[PDB]
Amino acid sequence: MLYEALRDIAARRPDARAVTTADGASASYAELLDLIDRTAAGLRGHGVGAGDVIACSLRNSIRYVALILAAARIGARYVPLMSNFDRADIATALRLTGPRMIVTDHQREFPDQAPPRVRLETLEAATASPREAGERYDGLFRSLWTSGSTGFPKQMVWRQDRFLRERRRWLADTGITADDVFFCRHTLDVAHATDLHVFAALLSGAELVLADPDAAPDVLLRQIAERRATAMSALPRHYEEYVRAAAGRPAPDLSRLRRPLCGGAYVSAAQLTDAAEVLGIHIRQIYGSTEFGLAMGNMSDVLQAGVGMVPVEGVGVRLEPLAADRPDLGELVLISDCTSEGYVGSDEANARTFRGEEFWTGDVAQRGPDGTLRVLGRVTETLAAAGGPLLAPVLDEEIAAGCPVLETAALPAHPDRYSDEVLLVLHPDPDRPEQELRKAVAEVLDRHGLRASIRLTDDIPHTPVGKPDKPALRRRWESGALGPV
Numbered sequence: 001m002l003y004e005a006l007r008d009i010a011a012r013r014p015d016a017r018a019v020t021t022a023d024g025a026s027a028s029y030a031e032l033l034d035l036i037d038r039t040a041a042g043l044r045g046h047g048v049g050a051g052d053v054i055a056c057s058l059r060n061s062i063r064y065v066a067l068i069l070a071a072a073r074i075g076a077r078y079v080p081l082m083s084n085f086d087r088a089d090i091a092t093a094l095r096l097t098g099p100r101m102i103v104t105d106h107q108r109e110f111p112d113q114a115p116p117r118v119r120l121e122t123l124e125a126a127t128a129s130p131r132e133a134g135e136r137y138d139g140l141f142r143s144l145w146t147s148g149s150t151g152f153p154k155q156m157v158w159r160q161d162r163f164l165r166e167r168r169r170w171l172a173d174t175g176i177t178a179d180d181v182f183f184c185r186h187t188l189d190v191a192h193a194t195d196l197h198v199f200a201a202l203l204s205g206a207e208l209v210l211a212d213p214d215a216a217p218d219v220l221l222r223q224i225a226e227r228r229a230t231a232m233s234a235l236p237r238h239y240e241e242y243v244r245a246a247a248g249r250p251a252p253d254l255s256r257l258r259r260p261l262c263g264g265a266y267v268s269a270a271q272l273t274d275a276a277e278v279l280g281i282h283i284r285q286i287y288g289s290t291e292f293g294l295a296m297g298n299m300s301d302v303l304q305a306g307v308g309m310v311p312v313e314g315v316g317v318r319l320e321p322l323a324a325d326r327p328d329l330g331e332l333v334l335i336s337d338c339t340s341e342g343y344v345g346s347d348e349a350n351a352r353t354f355r356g357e358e359f360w361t362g363d364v365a366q367r368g369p370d371g372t373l374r375v376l377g378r379v380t381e382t383l384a385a386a387g388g389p390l391l392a393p394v395l396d397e398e399i400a401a402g403c404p405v406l407e408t409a410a411l412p413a414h415p416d417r418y419s420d421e422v423l424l425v426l427h428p429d430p431d432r433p434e435q436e437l438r439k440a441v442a443e444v445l446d447r448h449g450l451r452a453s454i455r456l457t458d459d460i461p462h463t464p465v466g467k468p469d470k471p472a473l474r475r476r477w478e479s480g481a482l483g484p485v
Contacts, residue, residue, distance in 0.1 A: 001138050001160040002199070003073035003131060007033060009205045013178070018202065019062050022211040022223050027062050029205075032069075034128050035062065039070035041125035046118060048100055050075030050137065055099035055115065056189070057081045057108055060210045063120050064188050065198055067103060068142075070123075072160055075137035080189030082145060082153075084464060087111055089152065096155055096345065097143055143344065144191060144290050150471045155344040156290055162338040166293040167199050169338070173313045174259065174299060176231065178205035181256070183229035185211040185220050185238070191290040196233040196261065206231075217241040221252050231259035233286065236267045237465065243271075243278045251280045258301070261286045266377055266393035269305035270401075276303050285309050287375050292339050292359050296373060308372025317373065319365055322382070322389065322418065328367040329389055331379055334359040364391060381470075383412055384420045386449030392470075395422070395448065403440035404432035407460060409468035413453055414479050424452040425473050427460050453484055 010018075014030035027035065048054060054071050056078055058064045071078040079097050081090055091111040102110065105120040138161040145153035184197035188210075201208035209227045211220055221242055224232065234242075239262055246252055254260070260275075263286040275283045282301050287309055288294040296309040296317065311317050319330030335358055342350045353360055364382055365373045366389075377391035384390075392410040399408045406427040413421035422445070428437055438454075445452050461472035477485045 001136055001164050002141065002203075003036070003069055004136060005164060006036075006069060006202055007131070009202070013205060016178075016205070017207050019065060019208045019210060020227060021060075021062065022209065022215070022227070025062055032062070032066060032202075035066040035124065036069045036073060037128035037130060038125045039063070039066045039123050040074050040131075041127060041129035042123035043070055043074060043076070044129060045125060046101065046123070048074070048076055052076045052100040053097050053143070054078045055081050055094065055097065055102045057102055057104045057106070057117075058120055058188070059105055060184075060188050060193075060213065061105070061120070062210065063105075063124065065208070065210070067120065067123065068188070068194065068198070072137065072141040073131060073135075075139070075141075077140050077142055077157070079143035079155075080145070080187075082189055083187065090114070092152055093145075140341070146290065147190075150469070150475075154346050154349055156340045156342070157344055158340045162340075163199075163293075164203070166336070166338040167195065167203050169314045170294040170312055171200060171204055174297065176200060176204045176206060176259075180204065180206040180230045180259070181209060181228055182206060183209045183211060183224050183227060183232040185213055185215070185232075185234065187213050192233060192235075192264065195290075195293070196286075197231075200231070217245040221245055224257070225253045228256050230256050231261065232257070233261035233263065235264045236262060236271055237265065237467075239267075239271060239275055239279075239283060243274045247278050251278070254279055254281050257281050259299070260284060261297070263287050263297075266391070266397070268394070268397055270397070272303060272305045289361065290340070291342070291353065292334055292336065292361075295334050295336075295361075296375075298372065307370070308366075308368055308374040310372055317365075319367070319373075320360070322364070322379075326388065330365065332361045332363050332365040332373070332375060334361060364389065381412065382418055383410075383422055383448075383450060384418050386447075389418070390448055390450075392422075395444065395450070398444050398447075399424075399426075399441065402444060404429040404437055406458075407468055409460070409470050409473050411470055411474050411478065415474075420449060420451050422450050422452045423455070423474075423477055423479070425455045425457065425460070425468070425477065427458050428456055430458075453479070 010029035010033045015028050018029045018032045019027045099115050101115050102117045104117045140157050141160045144156045182197040182201040184193050186193040260281045262283045286297040298309045316335030318333045321327050321330040342354045365375045377393050381392040382389045395410040409425040411423045413423045455477050461469040
């Protein structure tokens, strides 16, 4: 179904630009469909067929885009071997998926019994296999991975029909047209790339710009302007990087960015105001998940500090209240007819997450007077603060910016309860006095009515992008029934 929809678009504008890479390469819609059809031809030539699973160990390239579409066209299913997978995690990922082959384009050590590796470029046959009339695949076409757990990530599978419907709904709500140019600086291994940029552009007849996820933010900022991008999605940390790179300099030319989307983590009022002042854009808040697709956003071209989102037209939302005291504050529960098919081989996770027709996000949202919803963070991160429930990322940003710490991680002190007690792990700035740390910390905590148990340490587990790994911090210092660790 995905190939078909792509082919219809290509037929109307065969010679229109479809994909541009930051470093020069390009393809029209007709050229891209030819590459897909030639990649289908080579995949068939290598014994791949419907139902097979194709693991991918690949950098961002037009060829990787064609491979995804070729897989979908022949009724195969692709799965990324995430770049942070080491040899052991590759073995595990292979045990869970059982792929027919690993398509590779860079040196990498695979485990001993791995499926055969095939170099990406050699899958492009010289002679294209035209898609035959009467061929359509509506079922599974991809396995994807969760993120942010200390465990091996959970496998998610999507059907083509549900994905295509979900993307068309978002594209309608969001106002995407063929005029748009999507700037994608994430690895194609993740839905942040493939959903918000690749299929968003191609199912629209728009243009996709493939950038290097490893490029420094100054480089990406020049490229966002040069390539005239109108739409992109990035994490808060990515916008903070952009801002820092541009702060104090004459503003970049981001005038074409009518859809600068941000989601995936806490986006503060200060981040949004910063982006306006430094980058001269109004960041548009979005919200979703690889499990669900896109659920909410705020496409208004205003500074969105202190403003929430609304459901994507066709998505249902309710709050499961944390307490009958505050109905406007609860776990966010979502309703859709076109989500993923859930988790592979994880019965506990599916049971807690897919409860019938409903999708339980495990995130805390709040309604505001204006009827919008602000997603505040994980339910497991709620603190009972002055002024209502407060989510730890909020306190983390406050402490980090106002106190002489190199980093901080705030967690609720006790696993099961909603308390004003915070477990506060501080990495002290060794250059600054300790009394200055505790005065500054006391101020933040008192601003929120919080009680804290403080753990000073420079032995912080970090994520690969340098943030505290709060799950590992909790497993070490969380309190028990008999007292503090």
